[PDB]
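Can you give me the bound-state structure? Components:
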Amino acid sequence: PKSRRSKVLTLAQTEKKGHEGKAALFSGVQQSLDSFDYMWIFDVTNMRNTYLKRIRDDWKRIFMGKTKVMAKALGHTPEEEHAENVSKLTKLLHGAVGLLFTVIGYFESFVQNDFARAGAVAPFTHVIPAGPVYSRAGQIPLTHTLEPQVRQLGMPTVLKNGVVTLLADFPLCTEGQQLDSRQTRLLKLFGITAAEFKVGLLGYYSKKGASVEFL
Amino acid sequence: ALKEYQVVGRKVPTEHEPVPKLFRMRLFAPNESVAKSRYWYFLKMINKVKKATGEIVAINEISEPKPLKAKVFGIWIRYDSRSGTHNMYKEFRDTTRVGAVEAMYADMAARHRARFRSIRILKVVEVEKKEDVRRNYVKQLLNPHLKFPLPHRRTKKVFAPHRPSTFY
Amino acid sequence: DIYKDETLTIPKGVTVDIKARNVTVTGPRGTLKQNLRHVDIEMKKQGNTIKFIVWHGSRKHNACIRSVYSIINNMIIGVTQGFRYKMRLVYAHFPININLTENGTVVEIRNFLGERITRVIKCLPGVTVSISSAVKDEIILEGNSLENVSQSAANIKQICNVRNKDIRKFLDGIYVSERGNIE
Amino acid sequence: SLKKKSKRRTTRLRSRIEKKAAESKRKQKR
Amino acid sequence: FKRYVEVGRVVLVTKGEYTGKLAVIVDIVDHKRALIDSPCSEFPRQVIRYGSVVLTHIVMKLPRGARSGIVAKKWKAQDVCNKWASSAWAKKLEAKKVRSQLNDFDRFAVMRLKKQRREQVNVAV
Amino acid sequence: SEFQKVVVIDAKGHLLGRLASVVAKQLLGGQKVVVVRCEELNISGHFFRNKLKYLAYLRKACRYNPSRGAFHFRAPSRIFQKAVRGMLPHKTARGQAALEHLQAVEGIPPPFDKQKRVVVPAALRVLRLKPGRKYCTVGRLSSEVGWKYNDIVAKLEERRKVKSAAFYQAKLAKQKKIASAKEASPVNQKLSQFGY
RNA sequence: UCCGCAUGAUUUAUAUGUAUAAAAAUAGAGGUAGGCUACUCUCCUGUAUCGUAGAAGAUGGGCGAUGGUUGAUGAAACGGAAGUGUUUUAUUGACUUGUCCAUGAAAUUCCAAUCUUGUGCGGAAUCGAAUCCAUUGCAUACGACUUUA
RNA sequence: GCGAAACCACAGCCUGGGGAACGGGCCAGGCAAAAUCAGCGGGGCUUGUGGCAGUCAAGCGGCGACAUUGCUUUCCUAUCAUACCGAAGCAGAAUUCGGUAAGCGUUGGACCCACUAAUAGGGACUACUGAUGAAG
RNA sequence: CUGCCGAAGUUUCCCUCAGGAUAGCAGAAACUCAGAUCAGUUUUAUGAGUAUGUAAAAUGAGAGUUUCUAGUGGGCCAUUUUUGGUAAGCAGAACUGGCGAUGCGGGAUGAACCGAACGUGAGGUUAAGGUGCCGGAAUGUACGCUCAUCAGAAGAAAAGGUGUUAGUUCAUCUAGACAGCAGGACGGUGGCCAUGGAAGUCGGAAUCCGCUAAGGAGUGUGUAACAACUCACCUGCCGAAUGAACUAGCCCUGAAAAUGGAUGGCGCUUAAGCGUACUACCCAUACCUCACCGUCUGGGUU
RNA sequence: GUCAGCAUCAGUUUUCGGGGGCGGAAAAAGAAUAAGGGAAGGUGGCUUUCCGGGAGUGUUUAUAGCCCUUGUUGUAAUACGUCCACUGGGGACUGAGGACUGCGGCUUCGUGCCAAGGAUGCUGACAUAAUGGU
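Here's the bound-state model for the whole set.
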């Protein structure tokens, strides 16, 4: 009766609160601004939830929600914001940044490696030798039992007698090249931890000092 | 063509109602008699006042106060559908309230194959705030830099000698 | 709706003459002459941009404006980057024998599934077929027009279809592997 | 024609269509 | 194109009792009607359709919905007349109008001069 | 509006029935009509639709001795003549005489390619059918249901256009010369007050 | 069969000026000069363009241009889709408004050229076939058909 | 060469429609060129899906839709074969179901018994066939 | 031969039968009152429970009779009621008109549909229905809908359509809407019975928790089991409208065969289809003016 | 006799045109010209952007203007409706009746004249034709 895109439906029963969720995030941001101390601005990075879970463990609460939504709730103008000189803070307040309560040394030093994300530059020039596939670049003393991965690769790989075989040498990634989605997904099947989680501690919105530096 | 009439009517004075209240409504009819007939039908259906018991006290044709100012009208109507009950609201842009009603009537006879019988016009309103305009086609008309090629140019002396330019 | 618009930025593709619905798009790689008479739309060339304009168009008419944009973009890609199609032969028992004639515009196919019918195809104009050495028994189709290269890739694939057998087991034939560009 | 049938209803159909419409209206009245 | 339904374009009326007159579009009522006006006294400001006009090549700046006085002042200032007549299109129309008014004696005057004009037939050998 | 002895209509871009209706009226009006270039006539509706409209015409044939049955002419001129004939009272002597005043030919033969070809704006496709509406040419529609002279007529049309263009270039060269001499005469603007 | 006068006329879905050949698109085409062209200009139907002034088109003169223009020609070129013709022509004889003059029309005193036979003209040159009868048998109810004569 | 009679309102092409009986006359079409010779006698139904009871319940104004539970010669295509096609645990072969498809076949002997690729289901004077023939 | 008047089908009963009656109608002859003397009509008042009747204002007409005497005493069609009813039609009465005796215009054509009730003509104007051509009359004006591989000019019918256009009621949206992309889509935990192997995804109940901005004891594919991918859930970039349920108009489908065929034909597709409004035009035996024929009636006429 | 043309008339009619009243919110508009109000689909500018331009940007007539109310020109015109026992043309059909009255108006004070109780006047052509028959 009308040409329109058919919408897929499922039964998750986990629909987000939408406006209520945004209000809850704003309330949490206000409480985090009302927290005791340590005035951190750092929430997430390219790392998975495991790094976030480990970071949350070493604290007695890192959370940002929708970026620039907490800043909007606080208000860019100093009149709306409860803090001082937040007009310049809001400009710096962007991306995955959130308050915490547990620090500086751990964030500066402890940087665990993790699988790379798209857009970055490869730390090296990974090359996949031809023949049987090597999951960990020939570190197995990486079996050839990857029966379903052969159909799921798409790259120059054919199944020979139940063994995945790359007919031609396929360079997985090269240093200085932007990490494509296909390159990142292909590297996911391998042990390429070409990333390092970082943090941002430029300033601290202390209750008394109110000096959030731009370092 | 249609013309807009204000008709003021009331029932006959009597001991029960020595001074019956005046009832005035604006309604669109091609002529005087249709306006009175539509008035009696409307008052009977709405308020339950009989034609015999009443009489018209004033009928006046109303001209357009500004027949040269481009205006946008919103029309609420109660369409008598196959079920006899349906409501509508359509937007129009022209210079005369009668023009909007006339264009609405042709629009009804086209997109719903309606009659003069089945249409009951609730209210015709002048809308002046741009952001209060709802319909998409009229809103896109309101943009300041309107310009478009002459749509459907289409242009006895049979047997013309040269092929028509049919263009600029 | 009075005006549906679609905008196209023209790269260093040299000549984009648009006389009478006909576009002679010429780039560094070559020249493609295409006709757009089938659609009735406005095409305006303002310096570094091309404006696709539909006045008082229905949705049936309006849907053509994106298609016209897409095909013009495709031919622009062709005269700038070109189109490359890699097809990998699959043979289980009988090798598939391929012969190339007329700089690779005609393909001869032999010994497919043991058949002795000579499956011969003439590539659509502007399509060159070559056998690559870096990867064994796979074919590279090079050309300027995506439509002709893609259809030629389709023609070769549908020529060598397995018949009366199972797709489940007899999964032999020629399949398109990669769909990229020259650079 | 161009069709699989004839669009001109023969006068029998012009005859019994209206009466069977009349019987339909009588049925709703009942 | 060359003819756009613009607020401020002057159009040539081709139907109605004002056939041949020159007016300027002041407003766009809708897809099929536009409001037009002319400084010429005989022609009143009114709403005309698009089958009853033809678009000309002259576009003159004029603010939306200007009154009759402002439109006339802008028309006089930008010299719309004597710009329309400068075109060979207007000259062809005026030639047609005056040729319609010729009487029998003037037709014989036309007779004689163009026969004098014809007999020149001087071409280089 | 004014009659000639004979009218030669160039039938390129005219609709089949729209042109045949005007021609039907002019024939009974008492005027000889020659329709040329019939193989570019247009019919509303997409090609496959009209191909079915004509393949149903092929189905009508008397079951006894089909030589008695209806004769399904394939040439574009004959299809146009069928349209006009059905729009005439051909079962009389005045309807019969109207057909005899009608000539329908595919292409423009030498007897007529040296005369002016007028068109009928009441039947022109560009003034009747909305843009984007599917239509089919009679010349294509005949070359797919039996008519076997499409290519030769197209071949002869190409040669005729070449000869006709060469004539026009010569006529323009002469016409621009006299126009230069036309404006050169001074009496031009001593008659300009009469609009000529 | 025409020369040829006719001679009587027969005549016109004649005909009243039997006036006019680009091609293509209509969300476009065309024209100008200069070196694929930047740029200028044209369109908006033929109410146009060409011819058109005279005892149904008379008889003269002057002025002005080498023209227009026709009847008849003695020839060249081109046109095959149905070539129904186009053009080049030189020629002759006209006609000769481009412009200005003189003669004549009238009591027709309020409206009502082309077309061919025709029939013959007194002068030219022209000298075929088919069937029946007969035959054949490749054909055949009879016609017809295939042969011969 | 001799030479009837029956019969005769008038006539004789076809498709559809004309309340019926739709016809040879009417209407709308297809069309339509003298004179004859010899054969042949021709003349808006309907379908592929049962009945009782309860439960929902889109909803409307108590019903309530599907679902659930209880028991008992020519023509048509709606294609058998041949052509192609899509699916199936379709390995090959063989086969099943379905789609396009009426070009082309659908047999021989007393429900049977074989052949076969298969032996699928159905509707129903003029014309016809040859032969002369006058004429622009 | 022409002219004039002109019914009836059902009544009034009666019958053994067909019938008559009897009316009615059409008439034929005689005689009242210039009247409330009537009416296939309305109105007012009046009682009883808009209609009812009686009585009286409107309205048109000259209104009564007693007497004798021809022809008819069917049926069909449709409306309104109307009880029994069923797949479904069907039956039953009462009433109404029309038709029989009726031609004419229109609907292609037609016993009943739409107009119109007929002497011979002229002119003018219309009804119904029409104005592309056949065909007399606008290839008119204006606003919309519709594209159909067999569009269009109450029976299947209820339903279906990623056809189109309008509306109705709900949703998010520059705290970045929809989509598109990159990334996360977790850790107790391979929760518990169930088993060769079941790790959320062969299978039975919950189906809980820490981080939250989010990770469902899990949406599917899949693996022997794994693993992996996708969603459902969030975030980064991206910049503005977008999604859901309904109703309607048009179109498509909603089975129907057996020589070739019909909106009447040809054809038509910004109609020559569908709907509306507006003008102009076309013509009947109809209406109007005049002439003529006839009948009837009225006035005058030594 | 036959048939044509015009004129002035009468009857019926059809079709354009002009002028003048009168009516409505005493049309509504509008124009011109004084107040006040409002703003935009935001102009000058406006600042910021970007390729003299584009784009915005937020504003209140400035280097465009618009809308609303009131006054005024005004008591404007126009439009429509309606009426004129006001008026100018074009066209078609008909010409029944056959002294005399009458009804009128002009007259012209006797008389008459007249478009007033139904067509006459002027002219031409044709006669072996033209009409009218079969």
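A couple of observations. Residues 151-196 of chain F form one domain. Residues 61 and 71 of chain F are 8 Å apart (CA to CA).
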